[PDB]
From a paper:
In order to obtain high-resolution data to observe the interface, we fused human [name] to the C terminus of the human FANCL RING domain with a linker between the proteins. Subsequently, we determined the structure for the E3-E2 pair, the FANCL RING domain (residues 299–373), and [name] (residues 1–153) to 2.4 Å resolution. The human RING domain contains two zinc atoms coordinated by a (Cys)4, His, (Cys)3 arrangement in a cross-brace structure. In complex with FANCL, [name] adopts a typical UBC-fold comprising a four-stranded beta meander, flanked by an N-terminal helix and two C-terminal helices. The interface between the RING domain and [name] buries a total surface area of ∼700 Å2. In common with other E3-E2 structures, the interface consists of a conserved hydrophobic interface between Pro62, Phe63, and Pro100 of [name] and Ile309, Trp341, and Pro360 of FANCL, as observed in other RING-E2 structures (Bentley et al., 2011; Dou et al., 2012; Plechanovová et al., 2012; Pruneda et al., 2012; Yin et al., 2009; Zheng et al., 2000). However, the hydrophobic surface of FANCL is extended by Tyr311, which is involved in pi stacking between Arg6 and Arg9. Additionally the nonconserved Asn103 of [name] further anchors Tyr311 of FANCL into position.
FANCL is a monomeric RING E3 ligase (Cole et al., 2010; Meetei et al., 2003), which specifically interacts with the E2, [name] (Alpi et al., 2008; Machida et al., 2006), for the strict monoubiquitination of FANCD2 (Garcia-Higuera et al., 2001; Timmers et al., 2001).
Author numbering:
A (entry chain B): 0 to 26, 33 to 152
B (entry chain Y): 303 to 351, 354 to 371
The structure:
Amino acid sequence: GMQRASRLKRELHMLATEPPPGITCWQDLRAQILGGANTPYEKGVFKLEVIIPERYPFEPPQIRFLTPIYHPNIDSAGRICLDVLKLPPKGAWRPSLNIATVLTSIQLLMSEPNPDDPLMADISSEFKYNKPAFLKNARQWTEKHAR
Amino acid sequence: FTMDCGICYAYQLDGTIPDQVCDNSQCGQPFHQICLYEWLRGLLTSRQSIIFGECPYCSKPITLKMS
Ligand SMILES: [Cl-]
Ligand code: NA
Ligand SMILES: [Zn+2]
Ligand SMILES: [Zn+2]
């Protein structure tokens, strides 16, 4: 488990010195993603849980939303449907990725939901066939739980 | 100046250095023997005679000789 420590040693330092815009992550780990501009999550602060498995970085981090969010690919429990969060061949995780990139991926997922990989079938359908209704609901959900 | 392992982000690991370099000239990421082996062994696309798998960065073929 020497590799887990060396990874965390450098990643935490870099996450503290030059983190992705709108994203912070500090020692289990806590992460925060600020709601993006021109998204229904704007002006929302989303806390996340980041658990680093014993076999990191050979296994992907385990990340869930602590802050409730209204999203097609994120369930009520904060579970995230994202390929880089799962091992191959089904998933897309590899040691070339890290905490910063995975979080950026989650941030990108928030901006651009994937209707083809739904965890919330109801929210997913709304996103496809009634975008404004989805946006309206996501806004209210953000105002109610994310600020 | 000398470069960290592309997998564990460290320079020294168990007294070894990242001397396992990607063949691909468009990549060339250095790895520890230990780290690259630990990653490749679990991959279905890997083969062993010396071990063959994919670079965790460029996905191109990579050869790892253990010692
Ligand atoms: Cl880093
Ligand atoms: Na995961
Ligand atoms: Zn290494
Ligand atoms: Zn490579």
